[PDB]
From a paper:
Gram-positive pili differ from those of Gram-negative bacteria by the presence of covalently linked subunits containing a conserved LPXTG motif or a variant of it. In [name], the genes coding for the pilus are contained in a 12 Kb pathogenicity island (the rlrA islet), consisting of seven genes of which rrgA, [name], and rrgC encode LPXTG-containing proteins. Only [name] is strictly necessary for the pilus formation while the other two are ancillary proteins. Here the crystal structure of the RrgBD2–D4 backbone subunit fitted into the EM reconstruction of the [name] pilus reveals for the first time the polymeric architecture of a Gram-positive pilus indicating a head-to-tail organization of individual backbone subunits.
The fragment of [name] designated RrgBD2-D4 (residues 184–627) was crystallized in three different crystal forms (in space groups P212121, P6122 and C2221). All the three forms of RrgBD2–D4 possess identical tertiary structure and all exhibited root mean square deviations (rmsds) with each other on aligned carbon alpha atoms of less than 7 Å. Each RrgBD2–D4 crystal form contained one molecule in the asymmetric unit, consisting of an elongated polypeptide (84 Å in length, 50 Å in width) made of three immunoglobulin-like domains (named D2, D3 and D4). The first 262 residues (184–446) form a dual domain (D2 and D3) made of two β-sandwiches of approximately 100 residues present in all crystal forms. The C-terminal 180 residues (446–627) form a third domain (D4) that contains an additional anti-parallel α-helical motif. All three domains D2, D3 and D4 are structurally homologous to each other, consisting of a pair of four-stranded β-sheets forming a β-sandwich configuration. We also find that each of the three crystallized domains of [name] contains intra-molecular isopeptide bonds involving: Asn 318-Lys193 for D2; Asn 428-Lys349 for D3, and Asn 623-Lys453 for D4. The C-terminal immunoglobulin domain (D4) of the crystal structure matched well into the smaller globular density present below the groove with the core of seven β-strands placed internally the filament and the additional anti-parallel α-helical motif exposed on the surface. The fitting confirmed that pilus volume (∼155×e3 Å3) and dimensions (52 Å in width and 252 Å in length) could accommodate two RrgBD2–D4 molecules organized in a head-to-tail arrangement with rotations ranging between 17° and 22° along the vertical axis of the lower RrgBD2–D4 subunit in respect to the upper one.
Residue numbers in the entry: 186 to 627
């Protein structure tokens, strides 16, 4: 029996015979980039499959673009009746009907199926944390109920629990068929985190001490004659798998491409390194003149546009009140009011920054505006690597306005690296931000 072959990659790069070996190197994209993917499957001559299904799911920072799936066989588009497509927020399932199966079965030569589609890197992607998809091709001469893992976060305790059930080909409950081993995998970066095994007398296992902001997946090692149906995620910290006794070959599971966004942290200080609240900046693409970084209007929701306005107004008020205090009056508790308002603002900006463009006039509501908190902190996330320039548009109370822009470089580690000259948060032991120095004489 010749086996089918599969690969998944960016558009034009998939190759089932010779898959890329450096796929674990993420490609830098910015929030709003539409990323195009390609799944190529080779089916041997004289196949007689009862099921040929593809299941694709992705981590939460990639939004599957509904309506973008195209599927061809030997470069001929399938007809609507040839497949059933179901689309969910995190991906899709594409299942050949009998009309579609007829196009890949009983053929006198290898058939090439190509599925293309895109996803948009979204406002939930975290700087330097990659986003990935995961695909299975589930097939066999009997009907197959297998599909691809659904990544999930642990619960707030850092716990993730696997539960397995077993059914026969008809979906009727049956006793555990065999020991079942799974690799717990970091779904963002594709690294194995642990291996667990369920013995036949105990169908649950909990993994502890996981990162609550990381998505993971339990990937079942093939059990002879059983196919793995990963159930829809309903709650953090829980993953469920149903093993169907379909008596089919193990599914195909290609290696997965990765994308990642970059970022930069800053701290507003004076020449004595005192941290300063309420400095406002925009981002330009040159040291003079040039353009300013803005979110694209047609990609910010009504709710998002209003939250930026609301939170900016609360921040302006919180900064004005903090500024009316004497230095001795600027206590931990007073700084906290500013930091809370700034954090709500920063979160609204990150939510509203769904795509970027460069504009001529900095006097534009969509131009990204950064504001320093009472520890002087401000940051930008979701970016392409490159060279950028901060322009101060409003100095901290009592200082002169800066007369030059400040160049900074965004890189694969510009957000996280130490050695940058100041701690983003005082006392952290990591100097992972760049100082922006204000003066009374410019």
């Amino acid at each position: 029996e010749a086996k089918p072959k599969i690969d998944k990659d960016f558009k034009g790069k998939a190759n089932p015979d010779t898959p890329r070996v450096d796929k674990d190197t993420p490609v830098n994209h910015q929030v709003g980039d539409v990323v195009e993917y390609e799944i190529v499957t080779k089916i041997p001559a004289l196949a007689n499959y009862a099921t040929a299904n593809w299941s694709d799911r992705m981590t939460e920072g990639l939004a599957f673009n509904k309506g973008t799936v195209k599927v061809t066989v030997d470069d001929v588009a399938l007809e609507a009746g040839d497949y059933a497509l179901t689309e969910v927020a995190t991906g899709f399932d594409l299942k050949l009907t009998d009309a579609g199966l007829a196009k890949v079965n009983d053929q006198n030569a290898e058939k090439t199926v190509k599925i293309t589609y895109s996803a948009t890197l979204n406002d939930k992607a975290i700087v330097e944390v990659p986003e990935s998809n995961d695909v299975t091709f589930n097939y066999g001469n009997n009907p197959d109920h297998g599909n691809t893992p659904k990544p999930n976060k642990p619960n707030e305790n850092g716990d993730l629990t696997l539960t397995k059930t077993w059914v026969d080909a008809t979906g009727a409950p049956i006793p555990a068929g065999a020991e079942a081993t799974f690799d717990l995998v970091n779904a963002q970066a594709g690294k194995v985190v642990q291996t667990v095994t369920l013995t036949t007398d105990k169908n649950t296992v909990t993994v502890n001490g996981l990162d609550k902001n990381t998505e993971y997946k339990f990937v079942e090692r093939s059990i002879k004659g059983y196919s793995a149906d990963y159930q829809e995620i309903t709650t953090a910290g829980e993953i469920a798998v149903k093993n169907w006794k379909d008596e089919n070959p193990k599914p195909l599971d290609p290696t997965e491409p990765k994308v990642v966004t970059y970022g930069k942290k800053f701290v507003k200080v004076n020449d004595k390194d005192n941290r300063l609240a309420g400095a406002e900046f925009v981002i330009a693409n040159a040291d003079n003149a040039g353009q300013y970084l803005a979110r694209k209007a047609d990609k910010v929701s009504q709710e998002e546009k209003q939250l930026v306005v609301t939170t900016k107004d609360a921040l302006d008020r919180a900064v004005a009140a903090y500024n009316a205090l004497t230095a001795q009056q600027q206590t931990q508790q007073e700084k906290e009011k500013v930091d809370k308002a700034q954090a709500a603002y920063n979160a609204a900006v990150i939510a509203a920054n769904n795509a970027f463009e460069w504009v001529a006039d900095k006097d534009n509501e969509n131009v990204v505006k950064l504001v320093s908190d009472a520890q002087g902190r401000f940051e930008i996330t979701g970016l392409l690597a490159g060279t950028y320039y901060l322009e101060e548009t409003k100095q901290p109370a009592g200082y002169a306005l800066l007369t030059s822009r400040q160049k900074f470089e965004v890189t694969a580690t510009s957000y996280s690296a130490t050695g940058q000259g100041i701690e983003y948060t005082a006392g952290s032991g990591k100097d992972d931000a760049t100082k922006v120095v204000n003066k009374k004489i410019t």
